[PDB]
Design a protein around this ligand. Sequence first.
Ligand SMILES: CN[C@@H]1[C@@H](O)[C@@H](O[C@@H]2[C@@H](O)[C@H](O[C@H]3O[C@H]([C@@H](C)O)[C@@H](O)[C@H](O)[C@H]3N)[C@@H](N)C[C@H]2N)OC[C@]1(C)O
Ligand SMILES: Nc1ncnc2c1ncn2[C@@H]1O[C@H](CSCC[C@H](N)C(=O)O)[C@@H](O)[C@H]1O
Length: 319
Amino acid sequence: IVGGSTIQPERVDAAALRQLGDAMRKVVGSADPTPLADLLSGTPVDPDELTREVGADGRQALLDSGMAVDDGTTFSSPLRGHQLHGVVVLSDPDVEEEVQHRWYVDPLWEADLLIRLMLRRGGARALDMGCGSGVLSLVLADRYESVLGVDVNPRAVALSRLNAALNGLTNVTFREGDMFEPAEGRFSRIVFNSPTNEEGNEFVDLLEAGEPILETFFRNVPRKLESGGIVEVNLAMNDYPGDPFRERLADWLGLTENGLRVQIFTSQRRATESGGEWKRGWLVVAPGPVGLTEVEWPYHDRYEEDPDALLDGTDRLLR
Ligand SMILES: CN[C@@H]1[C@@H](O)[C@@H](O[C@@H]2[C@@H](O)[C@H](O[C@H]3O[C@H]([C@@H](C)O)[C@@H](O)[C@H](O)[C@H]3N)[C@@H](N)C[C@H]2N)OC[C@]1(C)O
Ligand SMILES: Nc1ncnc2c1ncn2[C@@H]1O[C@H](CSCC[C@H](N)C(=O)O)[C@@H](O)[C@H]1O
């Protein structure tokens, strides 16, 4: 019921989308919403008041692209707008798992925090694996010559293309596919907000794909990573008795064989049935002494107190 709406930026002209985006930049994230911001808040709005704000052609672009639906009397949006780190981003609303369509897109549960964790350097070529709304791709576009976003969710690819268009971004490319299949060549930066959480080894859905999606990602990272390159990964990790996640990750990566350095920053931690541990952390591959290091960095708690404590934290902890 939520996350199956049609998204069609190709049905709308590129300048019109940029103009819509400009209108969203003005009002999205500001309290006391205008009609446009309220539409993008999930509030049914009067289509005439909306027209005052985006014009009649902007009014048509919203309908054609699928950002808005005519309920007859009112307009409503299946999507929700965000403005953060200099981009505007539409995504699905935050709702319970029981009402999520198969193509439900991550509503930015962690994107703002992850962007604050990301190393602030730029470079030549970036890959955003499982790009969802496109949010990480869009931010990376400001400091990378080109960015590729990949997702197996066709709806996420359309949404990603829509968001790029809204921001007038021209150096970002999105491809539908499974993992690294549409990603040719190597990248100096790879970022992955992985679909892993509480499911362990089991595939639940596109947002909880199980540990095997991390095996496949990390096994292939060495032939995809440019020499000197950086990989950043949000993930859940499961330590079982005599079987910690880190030993498996080292194997997948071919740590010594490939000359790789990994640091894991663990933020949340919880005891399990098996006498094991469930962890959520931030994993970084970056040039340095071959090996794996794990530290405790409670960036969730610190995000809640002061979001900008996280800026360059990962740089401080590596340089
Ligand atoms: C791409 N990675 C993400 C990953 O960041 C993580 O996000 C969870 C998220 O699902 C949780 O979100 C959960 O809880 C919210 C709400 C009650 O807060 C629900 O509305 C939502 O349906 C539920 N999945 C949230 N509470 C913590 C994040 N770290 O877990 C899910 C994910 C899709 O794998
Ligand atoms: N085999 C696969 N190949 C590419 N993407 C996949 C995949 N399996 C799951 N995914 C995608 O991984 C994404 C993780 S949700 C993260 C979305 C976005 N990067 C953000 O940070 O908000 C989902 O969009 C899901 O569709």
